[PDB]
Design a protein around this nucleic acid. Sequence first.
DNA 1: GGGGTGTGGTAG
DNA 2: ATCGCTACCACACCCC
Length: 438
Amino acid sequence: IVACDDPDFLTSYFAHSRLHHLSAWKANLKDKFLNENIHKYTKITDKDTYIIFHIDFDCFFATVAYLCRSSSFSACDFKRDPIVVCHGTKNSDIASCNYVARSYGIKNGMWVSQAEKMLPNGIKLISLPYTFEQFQLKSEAFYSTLKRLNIFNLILPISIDEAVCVRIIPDNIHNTNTLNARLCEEIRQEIFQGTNGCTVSIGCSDSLVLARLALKMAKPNGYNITFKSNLSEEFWSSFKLDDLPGVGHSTLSRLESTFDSPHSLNDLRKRYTLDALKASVGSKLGMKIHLALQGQDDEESLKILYDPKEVLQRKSLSIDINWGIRFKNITQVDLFIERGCQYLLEKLNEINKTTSQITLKLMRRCKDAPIEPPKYMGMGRCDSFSRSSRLGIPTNEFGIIATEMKSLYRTLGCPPMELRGLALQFNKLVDVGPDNNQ
DNA sequence: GGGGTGTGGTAG
DNA sequence: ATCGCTACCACACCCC
Ligand SMILES: Nc1nc2c(ncn2[C@H]2C[C@H](O)[C@@H](COP(=O)(O)OP(=O)(O)OP(=O)(O)O)O2)c(=O)[nH]1
Ligand SMILES: [Ca+2]
Ligand SMILES: [Ca+2]
Protein backbone atom coordinates (compact mmCIF):
# COMPACT_ATOMS: atom_id res chain seq x y z
CA ILE A 1 0.00 0.00 0.00
CA VAL A 2 1.46 3.32 -1.22
CA ALA A 3 -0.54 6.48 -0.63
CA CYS A 4 -0.35 9.62 -2.72
CA ASP A 5 1.79 11.46 -0.19
CA ASP A 6 4.37 8.66 -0.18
CA PRO A 7 7.45 9.33 -2.35
CA ASP A 8 6.96 5.95 -4.11
CA PHE A 9 3.41 6.69 -5.25
CA LEU A 10 4.19 7.76 -8.81
CA THR A 11 6.37 4.73 -9.45
CA SER A 12 3.87 2.25 -8.02
CA TYR A 13 0.87 3.81 -9.72
CA PHE A 14 2.63 3.79 -13.09
CA ALA A 15 3.83 0.24 -12.56
CA HIS A 16 0.20 -0.83 -12.03
CA SER A 17 -1.52 1.38 -14.60
CA ARG A 18 -2.25 -0.30 -17.92
CA LEU A 19 -3.13 3.10 -19.40
CA HIS A 20 0.30 4.46 -18.44
CA HIS A 21 1.90 1.38 -19.98
CA LEU A 22 -0.06 1.87 -23.21
CA SER A 23 1.23 5.45 -23.48
CA ALA A 24 4.82 4.65 -22.51
CA TRP A 25 4.92 1.74 -24.94
CA LYS A 26 3.56 3.94 -27.70
CA ALA A 27 6.04 6.74 -27.09
CA ASN A 28 9.03 4.37 -26.96
CA LEU A 29 7.93 2.75 -30.23
CA LYS A 30 7.73 6.18 -31.87
CA ASP A 31 11.22 7.13 -30.62
CA LYS A 32 12.61 3.78 -31.75
CA PHE A 33 11.16 4.40 -35.19
CA LEU A 34 12.76 7.84 -35.32
CA ASN A 35 16.17 6.46 -34.35
CA GLU A 36 16.26 3.52 -36.77
CA ASN A 37 15.34 5.92 -39.57
CA ILE A 38 17.61 8.79 -38.44
CA HIS A 39 19.45 8.59 -41.75
CA LYS A 40 17.21 6.26 -43.74
CA TYR A 41 14.63 8.26 -45.68
CA THR A 42 11.61 6.06 -45.05
CA LYS A 43 8.65 7.83 -46.68
CA ILE A 44 5.96 7.19 -49.25
CA THR A 45 5.96 9.54 -52.22
CA ASP A 46 3.15 10.47 -54.58
CA LYS A 47 5.17 8.37 -57.04
CA ASP A 48 4.17 5.22 -55.18
CA THR A 49 0.99 3.23 -55.39
CA TYR A 50 0.73 1.44 -52.09
CA ILE A 51 -1.35 -1.09 -50.24
CA ILE A 52 -2.01 -0.82 -46.49
CA PHE A 53 -1.90 -3.82 -44.20
CA HIS A 54 -3.31 -2.86 -40.82
CA ILE A 55 -2.34 -5.54 -38.33
CA ASP A 56 -3.58 -5.90 -34.75
CA PHE A 57 -3.43 -8.63 -32.10
CA ASP A 58 -6.81 -10.08 -31.20
CA CYS A 59 -7.75 -9.41 -27.50
CA PHE A 60 -4.03 -8.72 -26.84
CA PHE A 61 -3.93 -8.50 -23.03
CA ALA A 62 -6.42 -11.35 -22.63
CA THR A 63 -4.53 -13.62 -25.01
CA VAL A 64 -1.08 -12.93 -23.55
CA ALA A 65 -2.40 -13.07 -19.97
CA TYR A 66 -3.91 -16.43 -20.80
CA LEU A 67 -0.85 -17.97 -22.51
CA CYS A 68 1.31 -16.84 -19.56
CA ARG A 69 -1.23 -17.49 -16.80
CA SER A 70 0.12 -18.90 -13.55
CA SER A 71 -0.40 -22.53 -12.56
CA SER A 72 -3.45 -21.33 -10.59
CA PHE A 73 -5.39 -20.91 -13.90
CA SER A 74 -3.96 -23.98 -15.62
CA ALA A 75 -7.33 -25.54 -16.48
CA CYS A 76 -9.05 -22.42 -17.84
CA ASP A 77 -9.90 -22.56 -21.56
CA PHE A 78 -9.55 -19.55 -23.86
CA LYS A 79 -11.98 -20.98 -26.41
CA ARG A 80 -14.71 -21.82 -23.91
CA ASP A 81 -14.60 -19.60 -20.86
CA PRO A 82 -15.31 -15.85 -20.58
CA ILE A 83 -11.97 -14.28 -19.68
CA VAL A 84 -11.09 -10.73 -18.63
CA VAL A 85 -7.87 -9.06 -17.50
CA CYS A 86 -8.33 -6.74 -14.52
CA HIS A 87 -6.81 -5.71 -11.19
CA GLY A 88 -9.75 -6.25 -8.92
CA THR A 89 -13.18 -7.78 -8.35
CA LYS A 90 -15.82 -5.02 -8.31
CA ASN A 91 -15.27 -1.55 -9.80
CA SER A 92 -12.10 -2.60 -11.59
CA ASP A 93 -11.67 -1.78 -15.27
CA ILE A 94 -11.72 -4.67 -17.71
CA ALA A 95 -8.58 -3.95 -19.74
CA SER A 96 -9.25 -6.80 -22.23
CA CYS A 97 -11.77 -9.61 -22.67
CA ASN A 98 -11.76 -12.61 -24.95
CA TYR A 99 -14.34 -13.18 -27.65
CA VAL A 100 -16.20 -15.74 -25.53
CA ALA A 101 -16.70 -12.97 -22.97
CA ARG A 102 -17.61 -10.56 -25.77
CA SER A 103 -20.26 -13.05 -26.89
CA TYR A 104 -22.22 -12.12 -23.74
CA GLY A 105 -21.86 -8.41 -24.50
CA ILE A 106 -18.83 -7.62 -22.31
CA LYS A 107 -16.65 -4.75 -23.53
CA ASN A 108 -13.24 -3.40 -22.62
CA GLY A 109 -13.53 -0.58 -20.10
CA MET A 110 -16.50 -2.13 -18.28
CA TRP A 111 -16.20 -2.64 -14.55
CA VAL A 112 -16.03 -6.25 -13.38
CA SER A 113 -19.29 -5.97 -11.44
CA GLN A 114 -21.25 -4.94 -14.52
CA ALA A 115 -19.69 -7.61 -16.73
CA GLU A 116 -20.58 -10.15 -14.03
CA LYS A 117 -24.26 -9.34 -14.41
CA MET A 118 -24.12 -10.04 -18.13
CA LEU A 119 -23.46 -13.75 -17.69
CA PRO A 120 -26.20 -16.37 -17.25
CA ASN A 121 -26.21 -18.39 -14.04
CA GLY A 122 -23.71 -21.23 -13.97
CA ILE A 123 -21.29 -19.46 -16.31
CA LYS A 124 -18.41 -18.00 -14.31
CA LEU A 125 -16.19 -15.07 -15.23
CA ILE A 126 -12.44 -15.64 -15.27
CA SER A 127 -10.34 -12.70 -14.00
CA LEU A 128 -6.64 -12.96 -14.98
CA PRO A 129 -3.95 -10.59 -13.65
CA TYR A 130 -1.97 -8.34 -15.94
CA THR A 131 1.44 -9.55 -17.22
CA PHE A 132 3.06 -6.33 -18.42
CA GLU A 133 6.57 -7.65 -19.00
CA GLN A 134 5.28 -10.47 -21.20
CA PHE A 135 2.94 -8.02 -22.93
CA GLN A 136 6.05 -6.13 -23.98
CA LEU A 137 7.95 -9.31 -24.89
CA LYS A 138 5.17 -10.50 -27.21
CA SER A 139 5.11 -7.08 -28.87
CA GLU A 140 8.85 -7.21 -29.49
CA ALA A 141 8.30 -10.53 -31.25
CA PHE A 142 5.48 -8.89 -33.21
CA TYR A 143 7.62 -6.03 -34.50
CA SER A 144 10.59 -8.35 -35.04
CA THR A 145 8.58 -10.73 -37.24
CA LEU A 146 7.07 -7.82 -39.16
CA LYS A 147 10.54 -6.54 -40.04
CA ARG A 148 12.20 -9.83 -40.88
CA LEU A 149 9.44 -10.68 -43.39
CA ASN A 150 11.00 -7.93 -45.57
CA ILE A 151 7.70 -7.41 -47.44
CA PHE A 152 6.99 -3.84 -46.25
CA ASN A 153 8.49 -0.52 -47.17
CA LEU A 154 7.13 1.34 -44.16
CA ILE A 155 6.18 -0.21 -40.83
CA LEU A 156 4.27 2.29 -38.70
CA PRO A 157 3.88 1.68 -34.94
CA ILE A 158 0.40 2.52 -33.74
CA SER A 159 0.65 0.83 -30.35
CA ILE A 160 2.09 -2.13 -28.44
CA ASP A 161 -0.20 -4.53 -30.31
CA GLU A 162 -1.02 -2.66 -33.50
CA ALA A 163 0.81 -1.56 -36.62
CA VAL A 164 0.07 -0.01 -40.01
CA CYS A 165 2.35 -1.67 -42.56
CA VAL A 166 2.77 -0.27 -46.08
CA ARG A 167 3.75 -2.09 -49.29
CA ILE A 168 4.65 -0.14 -52.41
CA ILE A 169 3.43 -1.66 -55.66
CA PRO A 170 5.57 -1.11 -58.77
CA ASP A 171 3.54 -0.16 -61.80
CA ASN A 172 5.82 -2.89 -63.23
CA ILE A 173 3.84 -5.46 -61.25
CA HIS A 174 0.22 -6.51 -61.21
CA ASN A 175 -1.01 -6.82 -57.63
CA THR A 176 -3.66 -9.50 -57.14
CA ASN A 177 -5.91 -10.58 -54.25
CA THR A 178 -4.14 -13.97 -54.47
CA LEU A 179 -0.80 -12.39 -53.57
CA ASN A 180 -2.50 -10.27 -50.87
CA ALA A 181 -4.20 -13.25 -49.24
CA ARG A 182 -0.88 -15.06 -49.26
CA LEU A 183 0.89 -12.15 -47.56
CA CYS A 184 -1.87 -11.97 -44.94
CA GLU A 185 -1.63 -15.69 -44.27
CA GLU A 186 2.17 -15.51 -44.03
CA ILE A 187 1.94 -12.54 -41.66
CA ARG A 188 -0.64 -14.30 -39.52
CA GLN A 189 1.27 -17.61 -39.47
CA GLU A 190 4.70 -16.16 -38.71
CA ILE A 191 3.32 -14.00 -35.90
CA PHE A 192 1.42 -16.93 -34.39
CA GLN A 193 4.76 -18.79 -34.43
CA GLY A 194 6.96 -15.91 -33.29
CA THR A 195 4.66 -15.06 -30.35
CA ASN A 196 4.06 -18.73 -29.48
CA GLY A 197 0.27 -18.67 -29.66
CA CYS A 198 -1.00 -15.09 -30.23
CA THR A 199 -3.23 -14.26 -33.20
CA VAL A 200 -3.45 -11.10 -35.30
CA SER A 201 -6.18 -10.02 -37.67
CA ILE A 202 -5.42 -7.95 -40.74
CA GLY A 203 -7.21 -5.29 -42.75
CA CYS A 204 -5.92 -4.90 -46.28
CA SER A 205 -6.87 -2.05 -48.61
CA ASP A 206 -5.69 1.01 -50.55
CA SER A 207 -6.76 3.58 -47.95
CA LEU A 208 -5.94 3.70 -44.26
CA VAL A 209 -9.55 4.12 -43.29
CA LEU A 210 -10.70 1.16 -45.37
CA ALA A 211 -7.82 -0.88 -43.98
CA ARG A 212 -9.05 -0.07 -40.46
CA LEU A 213 -12.62 -1.00 -41.29
CA ALA A 214 -11.44 -4.15 -43.07
CA LEU A 215 -9.61 -5.03 -39.85
CA LYS A 216 -12.73 -4.71 -37.72
CA MET A 217 -14.47 -6.83 -40.34
CA ALA A 218 -11.60 -9.31 -40.14
CA LYS A 219 -11.72 -9.93 -36.38
CA PRO A 220 -11.49 -12.39 -34.75
CA ASN A 221 -8.39 -14.21 -36.07
CA GLY A 222 -8.95 -13.58 -39.74
CA TYR A 223 -8.18 -11.16 -42.51
CA ASN A 224 -10.13 -9.01 -44.90
CA ILE A 225 -9.20 -7.50 -48.24
CA THR A 226 -11.43 -4.60 -49.31
CA PHE A 227 -10.26 -2.10 -51.89
CA LYS A 228 -12.07 1.03 -52.94
CA SER A 229 -13.10 -0.90 -56.05
CA ASN A 230 -14.87 -3.53 -53.88
CA LEU A 231 -16.97 -1.06 -51.90
CA SER A 232 -20.59 -2.12 -51.57
CA GLU A 233 -23.78 -1.79 -49.57
CA GLU A 234 -23.01 -5.13 -47.89
CA PHE A 235 -19.77 -3.57 -46.71
CA TRP A 236 -21.13 -0.33 -45.26
CA SER A 237 -24.15 -2.13 -43.76
CA SER A 238 -21.88 -4.18 -41.51
CA PHE A 239 -20.44 -1.27 -39.49
CA LYS A 240 -21.64 0.80 -36.55
CA LEU A 241 -21.22 4.56 -36.76
CA ASP A 242 -18.51 4.55 -34.08
CA ASP A 243 -16.42 2.17 -36.17
CA LEU A 244 -15.38 5.24 -38.16
CA PRO A 245 -12.05 6.67 -36.95
CA GLY A 246 -12.69 9.96 -35.28
CA VAL A 247 -16.20 8.91 -34.17
CA GLY A 248 -16.27 8.40 -30.43
CA HIS A 249 -19.28 8.65 -28.15
CA SER A 250 -19.75 12.44 -28.35
CA THR A 251 -19.59 12.51 -32.14
CA LEU A 252 -21.83 9.43 -32.21
CA SER A 253 -24.45 11.16 -30.06
CA ARG A 254 -24.42 14.21 -32.35
CA LEU A 255 -24.72 12.09 -35.50
CA GLU A 256 -27.62 10.11 -34.06
CA SER A 257 -29.40 13.37 -33.27
CA THR A 258 -28.82 14.96 -36.66
CA PHE A 259 -29.64 11.94 -38.80
CA ASP A 260 -32.43 10.08 -37.01
CA SER A 261 -30.38 7.38 -35.28
CA PRO A 262 -28.59 5.69 -38.19
CA HIS A 263 -27.76 2.14 -37.17
CA SER A 264 -25.04 1.44 -39.73
CA LEU A 265 -22.59 3.33 -41.90
CA ASN A 266 -24.86 2.40 -44.79
CA ASP A 267 -27.76 4.18 -43.07
CA LEU A 268 -25.60 7.24 -42.43
CA ARG A 269 -24.15 7.11 -45.95
CA LYS A 270 -27.59 7.24 -47.57
CA ARG A 271 -29.04 9.94 -45.32
CA TYR A 272 -26.25 12.48 -45.07
CA THR A 273 -25.48 15.72 -46.86
CA LEU A 274 -21.99 17.13 -46.31
CA ASP A 275 -23.36 20.48 -45.11
CA ALA A 276 -25.56 18.99 -42.37
CA LEU A 277 -22.66 16.71 -41.45
CA LYS A 278 -20.30 19.66 -40.99
CA ALA A 279 -23.05 21.40 -39.04
CA SER A 280 -23.56 18.42 -36.76
CA VAL A 281 -19.99 17.54 -35.77
CA GLY A 282 -17.60 20.21 -37.12
CA SER A 283 -16.16 21.30 -40.46
CA LYS A 284 -12.92 19.30 -40.40
CA LEU A 285 -14.44 16.22 -38.73
CA GLY A 286 -17.48 16.51 -40.99
CA MET A 287 -15.22 16.45 -44.04
CA LYS A 288 -13.20 13.49 -42.72
CA ILE A 289 -16.34 11.46 -42.17
CA HIS A 290 -17.51 12.43 -45.65
CA LEU A 291 -14.20 11.32 -47.15
CA ALA A 292 -14.27 8.14 -45.07
CA LEU A 293 -17.77 7.30 -46.29
CA GLN A 294 -16.19 7.12 -49.76
CA GLY A 295 -13.30 5.00 -48.51
CA GLN A 296 -10.90 7.92 -48.82
CA ASP A 297 -8.38 9.31 -46.38
CA ASP A 298 -8.29 13.03 -45.55
CA GLU A 299 -5.05 14.96 -45.95
CA GLU A 300 -4.52 14.99 -42.18
CA SER A 301 -4.48 11.20 -41.94
CA LEU A 302 -2.25 10.97 -45.01
CA LYS A 303 0.66 12.81 -43.37
CA ILE A 304 1.77 9.71 -41.49
CA LEU A 305 2.58 8.16 -44.88
CA TYR A 306 4.26 11.03 -46.71
CA ASP A 307 6.13 12.46 -43.72
CA PRO A 308 6.21 9.92 -40.91
CA LYS A 309 9.19 11.40 -39.06
CA GLU A 310 7.33 14.60 -38.20
CA VAL A 311 4.10 12.80 -37.36
CA LEU A 312 5.83 10.51 -34.83
CA GLN A 313 7.94 13.38 -33.42
CA ARG A 314 6.92 14.12 -29.82
CA LYS A 315 5.65 17.71 -29.56
CA SER A 316 4.65 17.89 -25.88
CA LEU A 317 5.19 15.86 -22.75
CA SER A 318 3.03 15.32 -19.68
CA ILE A 319 1.70 13.09 -16.91
CA ASP A 320 -1.81 12.67 -15.54
CA ILE A 321 -2.76 11.22 -12.17
CA ASN A 322 -6.47 10.99 -11.63
CA TRP A 323 -6.56 8.03 -9.27
CA GLY A 324 -5.46 7.75 -5.66
CA ILE A 325 -5.48 11.54 -5.14
CA ARG A 326 -6.32 12.28 -1.48
CA PHE A 327 -4.30 15.11 0.04
CA LYS A 328 -4.93 16.77 3.41
CA ASN A 329 -2.95 19.99 3.10
CA ILE A 330 -1.19 22.25 0.59
CA THR A 331 2.30 21.14 1.67
CA GLN A 332 1.65 17.58 0.51
CA VAL A 333 0.13 18.77 -2.77
CA ASP A 334 3.23 20.88 -3.37
CA LEU A 335 5.60 17.94 -2.76
CA PHE A 336 3.60 15.78 -5.12
CA ILE A 337 3.84 18.50 -7.77
CA GLU A 338 7.61 18.55 -7.29
CA ARG A 339 7.81 14.77 -7.58
CA GLY A 340 5.85 15.06 -10.79
CA CYS A 341 8.08 17.79 -12.16
CA GLN A 342 11.19 15.79 -11.32
CA TYR A 343 9.79 12.78 -13.17
CA LEU A 344 8.85 14.88 -16.20
CA LEU A 345 12.26 16.53 -16.23
CA GLU A 346 13.99 13.17 -16.18
CA LYS A 347 12.00 12.30 -19.31
CA LEU A 348 12.68 15.71 -20.88
CA ASN A 349 16.41 15.33 -20.39
CA GLU A 350 16.39 11.88 -21.97
CA ILE A 351 15.18 13.51 -25.18
CA ASN A 352 17.54 16.46 -24.81
CA LYS A 353 14.98 19.23 -24.97
CA THR A 354 13.75 22.22 -23.01
CA THR A 355 10.25 23.65 -22.52
CA SER A 356 8.92 27.14 -23.16
CA GLN A 357 5.30 26.71 -21.94
CA ILE A 358 3.78 24.55 -19.20
CA THR A 359 0.27 23.72 -18.03
CA LEU A 360 -1.32 22.50 -14.82
CA LYS A 361 -4.67 20.74 -15.00
CA LEU A 362 -6.64 19.44 -12.03
CA MET A 363 -9.84 17.58 -11.20
CA ARG A 364 -11.94 18.88 -8.33
CA ARG A 365 -14.74 17.01 -6.56
CA CYS A 366 -18.10 18.30 -7.77
CA LYS A 367 -19.70 20.19 -4.93
CA ASP A 368 -22.63 17.72 -4.71
CA ALA A 369 -20.52 14.58 -5.25
CA PRO A 370 -19.57 12.12 -2.52
CA ILE A 371 -16.17 12.54 -0.91
CA GLU A 372 -15.56 8.84 -1.53
CA PRO A 373 -16.80 7.84 -4.99
CA PRO A 374 -18.06 4.41 -6.03
CA LYS A 375 -14.65 3.43 -7.41
CA TYR A 376 -12.18 2.84 -4.63
CA MET A 377 -9.71 5.76 -4.81
CA GLY A 378 -11.34 7.06 -7.96
CA MET A 379 -11.69 10.68 -8.93
CA GLY A 380 -15.48 10.39 -9.21
CA ARG A 381 -17.57 13.19 -10.66
CA CYS A 382 -15.31 16.22 -11.07
CA ASP A 383 -14.99 19.67 -12.56
CA SER A 384 -11.88 20.30 -14.67
CA PHE A 385 -9.66 23.38 -14.41
CA SER A 386 -6.51 24.16 -16.35
CA ARG A 387 -4.14 27.06 -16.69
CA SER A 388 -0.96 27.49 -18.74
CA SER A 389 2.05 29.78 -18.55
CA ARG A 390 4.79 30.78 -20.98
CA LEU A 391 8.30 30.66 -19.60
CA GLY A 392 10.73 33.51 -20.37
CA ILE A 393 13.57 31.48 -21.90
CA PRO A 394 13.19 27.79 -22.80
CA THR A 395 14.39 25.84 -19.80
CA ASN A 396 14.85 22.52 -18.13
CA GLU A 397 15.57 23.96 -14.69
CA PHE A 398 13.59 22.31 -11.88
CA GLY A 399 13.66 25.49 -9.78
CA ILE A 400 11.88 27.57 -12.41
CA ILE A 401 9.46 24.90 -13.57
CA ALA A 402 8.36 23.45 -10.27
CA THR A 403 7.88 26.95 -8.85
CA GLU A 404 5.65 28.02 -11.71
CA MET A 405 3.72 24.75 -11.43
CA LYS A 406 2.97 25.30 -7.77
CA SER A 407 1.99 28.87 -8.58
CA LEU A 408 -0.25 27.60 -11.33
CA TYR A 409 -1.92 25.37 -8.76
CA ARG A 410 -2.33 28.39 -6.49
CA THR A 411 -4.23 30.45 -9.02
CA LEU A 412 -6.75 27.66 -9.60
CA GLY A 413 -7.82 27.83 -5.95
CA CYS A 414 -8.60 24.16 -5.37
CA PRO A 415 -8.68 23.23 -1.67
CA PRO A 416 -6.34 20.26 -1.15
CA MET A 417 -9.01 18.01 0.36
CA GLU A 418 -11.18 18.62 -2.73
CA LEU A 419 -8.39 17.61 -5.11
CA ARG A 420 -9.03 14.38 -7.02
CA GLY A 421 -6.73 14.62 -10.01
CA LEU A 422 -3.67 16.35 -11.38
CA ALA A 423 -1.93 16.67 -14.72
CA LEU A 424 1.45 18.31 -15.41
CA GLN A 425 2.30 19.32 -18.98
CA PHE A 426 5.27 20.61 -20.97
CA ASN A 427 3.42 22.10 -23.94
CA LYS A 428 6.19 23.43 -26.23
CA LEU A 429 9.53 21.69 -26.57
CA VAL A 430 12.72 23.25 -27.95
CA ASP A 431 15.78 21.36 -29.18
CA VAL A 432 19.11 21.75 -27.42
CA GLY A 433 21.92 22.09 -29.93
CA PRO A 434 25.71 22.08 -29.59
CA ASP A 435 25.68 25.89 -29.52
CA ASN A 436 24.63 27.27 -26.13
CA ASN A 437 26.43 30.62 -26.03
CA GLN A 438 23.82 32.94 -24.47
C1' DG B 1 -3.47 37.63 -42.30
C1' DG B 2 -0.85 36.62 -37.49
C1' DG B 3 -0.94 35.49 -32.86
C1' DG B 4 -3.11 34.30 -27.96
C1' DT B 5 -6.12 31.14 -24.19
C1' DG B 6 -8.90 27.17 -22.16
C1' DT B 7 -11.85 23.33 -23.26
C1' DG B 8 -13.42 18.98 -25.75
C1' DG B 9 -12.82 14.97 -27.92
C1' DT B 10 -10.57 10.66 -29.45
C1' DA B 11 -7.73 6.53 -29.02
C1' DG B 12 -5.25 2.15 -27.45
C1' DA C 1 -10.14 -2.76 -3.03
C1' DT C 2 -7.60 -0.87 -7.14
C1' DC C 3 -3.95 1.51 -10.21
C1' DG C 4 -9.66 6.47 -14.45
C1' DC C 5 -2.84 7.80 -19.19
C1' DT C 6 -1.46 10.88 -22.45
C1' DA C 7 -0.53 13.02 -27.34
C1' DC C 8 -2.45 16.14 -30.24
C1' DC C 9 -6.12 17.88 -33.35
C1' DA C 10 -9.92 20.91 -33.44
C1' DC C 11 -12.71 24.55 -31.88
C1' DA C 12 -14.59 29.02 -29.54
C1' DC C 13 -13.25 33.15 -28.45
C1' DC C 14 -9.93 36.85 -27.52
C1' DC C 15 -5.99 40.31 -29.05
C1' DC C 16 -3.77 42.98 -32.76
N1 LIG D 1 -9.65 0.08 -26.21
C1 LIG D 1 -9.04 0.00 -25.01
N2 LIG D 1 -8.12 -0.97 -24.90
C2 LIG D 1 -7.49 -1.08 -23.69
C3 LIG D 1 -7.78 -0.22 -22.62
N3 LIG D 1 -7.02 -0.58 -21.60
C4 LIG D 1 -6.23 -1.64 -21.96
N4 LIG D 1 -6.55 -1.92 -23.24
C5 LIG D 1 -5.76 -3.06 -23.81
C6 LIG D 1 -6.75 -3.94 -24.56
C7 LIG D 1 -5.82 -4.63 -25.50
O1 LIG D 1 -5.33 -5.84 -24.82
C8 LIG D 1 -4.75 -3.58 -25.83
C9 LIG D 1 -4.98 -2.98 -27.21
O2 LIG D 1 -6.31 -2.40 -27.38
P1 LIG D 1 -7.38 -2.98 -28.44
O3 LIG D 1 -8.12 -1.84 -29.09
O4 LIG D 1 -6.67 -3.73 -29.53
O5 LIG D 1 -8.44 -4.01 -27.70
P2 LIG D 1 -8.27 -5.70 -27.42
O6 LIG D 1 -6.89 -6.11 -27.83
O7 LIG D 1 -8.38 -6.03 -25.94
O8 LIG D 1 -9.35 -6.55 -28.45
P3 LIG D 1 -9.51 -6.59 -30.17
O9 LIG D 1 -8.30 -5.96 -30.80
O10 LIG D 1 -10.78 -5.85 -30.72
O11 LIG D 1 -9.53 -8.05 -30.70
O12 LIG D 1 -4.94 -2.54 -24.85
C10 LIG D 1 -8.77 0.77 -22.86
O13 LIG D 1 -9.08 1.55 -21.95
N5 LIG D 1 -9.39 0.88 -24.03
CA1 LIG E 1 -5.74 -6.00 -29.98
CA1 LIG F 1 -8.82 1.80 -30.60
